[PDB]
Design a protein around this ligand. Structure first.
Ligand SMILES: [Zn+2]
Ligand SMILES: [Zn+2]
Ligand SMILES: [Zn+2]
Ligand SMILES: [Zn+2]
Lengths: 199, 199, 199, 199
DNA sequence: AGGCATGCCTAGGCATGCCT
DNA sequence: AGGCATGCCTAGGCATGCCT
């Protein structure tokens, strides 16, 4: 009955884990991931590659959902949406609704969904197994507002929750990670890791 | 026949206990809990996470009720309500009556009830067992007046009484805690703990 | 066209002036007037005597009106009225609307008015000339909220505007003074006068 | 033919001048005017008193119009309006259209106009002469976005253009001043004045 | 990439009905 | 009458997109 999706890591029967690319720590790198914070730092609308790893191939018709929630207890109830400014700027690829924060690029079967009870947005693609001789598949996500956007995330941290779901909407696996969308992900990742260390 | 609900701790057959998050002692932290005082300090309308722990899962259709009473003997008879100012400020989410002090956020099955004999307000949600691999569930409560509100709590301390109730309104368990809603929960928790020590 | 009454002092052709009584400035005197601040300090609902002085007798049917406005430019446009708690206190004399800040006591011809355009409150009594060998007439006003009332004056200072008006509605004279309604008028007068002299 | 209003000062035959109130330049004063910069610094939606001074009294039916234009040549052609977040905040008084930057408060005859050719917004009140023994009349303007609002003024300076216009629409006089709507008017005024003198 | 911007987070300290 | 309460005013300093 909670309207807040769970964020609990659940590797599940198929051994579901996420993977992220080692990037530069240059000031304005487009996407970078901090293991220490379990946090992705990225620029608005740039490609954020996320690897899916499983120990065993899930059943056919399995789906991959991405949803954002505010991380802080104080904001968890609020639906993460795009700010009014970016919602009106007609940057849609034709598939993604202007209100949705998370897009998937380069997938012909993407679906953008809206929970009729919680009003929360999400973007779903079918799960595909890796090519023979590869260990993972990679989804290219895009975040369409900055963390700081007035009237949107308004500087609040979010978590992206990725779930592996069988065809019948049951939970196969869940992982999550924090996201900051910002102008200078390298600077900001360095600042946050140093702040963690300093205090 | 008493119009004052009981505050007596009753762990009961299911081992019912409350839990609270460790928070900053920063001056204006939004919510903080003092074990020495069994007292929660929080800001008006901010999220107050309350954990529910049971040794054994209660029967289905079990419900979780929250009710406020004045803590002092001198005031226990008086129904705790919102002050006239906040009652008229049209801040309702559409579900909570403007008169009710305690709200629950993020729950699709919340009910706001009113005792026909005592006129006391309460807010109820269905009990849900923890997710597999978690020990507790968490309810997000909100207190919609400061303790100091003129015409309302008027600087008097309250207790929140959480009861675990079976489908047929029988008591399964009961816990309670003091609450101060205030502008600077960190300062005020330090002051009260130090006052306890000094005298 | 402006919805804010003028406060401009206008003694007019009848020589219209206000006077105040000397009051012992004990910490909690019921009412005291500071000439240096042109400001009255009084307790909620206590008698505030205000003297009407005039060089020439006004024509029959002259009336005396009192209105409150917020003193500061930031609040001028907001109608001065009672806070929600004192509005529902059921303390009307059967004549004053429960929302009106200013009442007149001890007058068989008092009338309370609501401006249909500005929605501002005022209280009118007929002007009576002094008795032979008296120099002035006194009106007894009551202020039915503290300056600090939440949802009412909310610590903002107000002016009382006293107008002398003939039966045809012409302005014959106007005077004003600041008001603080508070628990300890003698203390508060002393504190503001001190603050005045340290500027 | 130009869609940009003229800002050219024109006191005209009635000696039309603007005046401003002396304000205390605390860090967050609500409104302050810098004569050296001819610039008002004010907080979002707070009262900005603007004095209208005139040597000869304008004819009946004279109106006072306020419009905003971007100050820099690079932005002059762009209509000044509210950002998308604030346009959708539902903060109208029931009279100002939600898109208009400039409101007039406390006037029973305000009208909000959209130019059918340029689409620029303006707000108009009737001109009222000063009361006898008064030297000027004051309008209370409000600005409903910060200069920094994303998707609105976006940190670009604007000018407020005040025109005195007869009922037939003749220009009787024109004055203007720069505006910054910001969180800390006293600070920001100090900083820009400092920057001016280091040049 | 260096460094400014500017709303906003923070703590010190005052307020003011009210307790003693 | 003395002195505490407690929401909130004040100033310092950080944020973070963006200018140079
Ligand atoms: Zn955005
Ligand atoms: Zn309240
Ligand atoms: Zn009141
Ligand atoms: Zn805006």
């Amino acid at each position: 009955s909670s309207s807040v999706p769970s964020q609990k890591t659940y590797q599940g029967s198929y051994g579901f884990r996420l993977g992220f690319l080692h990037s530069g720590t240059a000031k304005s790198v487009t996407c970078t991931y901090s293991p220490a914070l379990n946090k992705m730092f990225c620029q608005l609308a740039k490609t954020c590659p996320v690897q899916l790893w499983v120990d065993s191939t899930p059943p056919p018709g399995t789906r991959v959902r991405a949803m954002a929630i505010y991380k802080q207890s104080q904001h968890m109830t609020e639906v993460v949406r795009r700010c009014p400014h970016h919602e009106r700027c007609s940057d849609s690829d034709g598939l993604a609704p202007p209100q949705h924060l998370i897009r998937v690029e380069g997938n012909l079967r993407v679906e953008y969904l809206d929970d009729r009870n919680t009003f929360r947005h999400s973007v779903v693609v079918p799960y595909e197994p890796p090519e023979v001789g590869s260990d993972c598949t990679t989804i290219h996500y895009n975040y369409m507002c900055n963390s700081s956007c007035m009237g949107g995330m308004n500087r609040r941290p979010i978590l992206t929750i990725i779930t592996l779901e069988d065809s019948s909407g049951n939970l196969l696996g869940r992982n999550s990670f924090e996201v900051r969308v910002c102008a200078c992900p390298g600077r900001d990742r360095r600042t946050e890791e140093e702040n963690l260390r300093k205090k």
